Amino acid sequence: NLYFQSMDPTQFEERHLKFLQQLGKGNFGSVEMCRYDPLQDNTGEVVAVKKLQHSTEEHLRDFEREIEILKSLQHDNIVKYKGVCYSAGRRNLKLIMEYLPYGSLRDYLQKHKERIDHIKLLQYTSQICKGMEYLGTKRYIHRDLATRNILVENENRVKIGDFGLTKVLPQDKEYYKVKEPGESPIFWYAPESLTESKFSVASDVWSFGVVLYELFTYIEKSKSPPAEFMRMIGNDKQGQMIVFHLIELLKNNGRLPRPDGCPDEIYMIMTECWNNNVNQRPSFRDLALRVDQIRDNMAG
């Protein structure tokens, strides 16, 4: 009560944060490109600014937690936190980050195939794994690992880009049980997340297996995880029937197919991530080493 937590409300003053572009509407969030020009000279750093879409009390509280999570992370493959802008005369909150100029990995794969080959896909795979190793050291569970939530800095570097669903493990448990779910990315969820709302490092590994699938499908039309799972379950199914069939399919070893052109060894990594036995999934450290060994064992 007596002394409120630190903040730094002068680092990004709203009057000096200049709009450049709308980047996208995620899920209950909106991201802008802005320039922070404290000298009012038309210069300054370009930044990304994440804002809420629906400013309810619950969302503002969750957003503060998300900001604290991102501020606690410093790693080459995690988007860089810069600060907060307490706009509307210090009656609102906006998250300030570095700006990564190629956008989401999902869109980059679809729009920039001219500059993507398997070597790059393996580099991105390795980088995502390393970002996730780092999250695990903080006991953070991402819960939404998907190419749409990874950002592309340049042809040689990706970073995990959004943390809107990330949770902190309890001190005494190796999973977080989510007890008020919002919208759920079911086609990236491990079976125990679908059936028990349990999220862990191991369920992030399951989702990483879906990310790896995404990379090698080159986000081809009809090849996305939702499209392929719906083809397998039945395209006409709606509502909860989708979830019932997805669970039954996964529990009995139904899986996304090997993408066209995907090496057998890379599909093997996918299938090992997609183990119904949580403890038998590889760690992110195992995966980073294996991927980097594959890369390093190539000629040259």
Ligand SMILES: C[C@H](Nc1cc(-c2cnn(C)c2)cc(Nc2cnccn2)n1)c1ccc(F)cc1
């Ligand atoms: C919604 C936002 N969309 C978006 C689009 C583009 C873009 C499009 N086209 N081009 C040439 C660039 C750039 C950025 N950059 C950012 C965003 N947040 C922080 C740092 N950088 N974000 C986003 C996407 C994925 C993700 F994981 C986090 C945010």
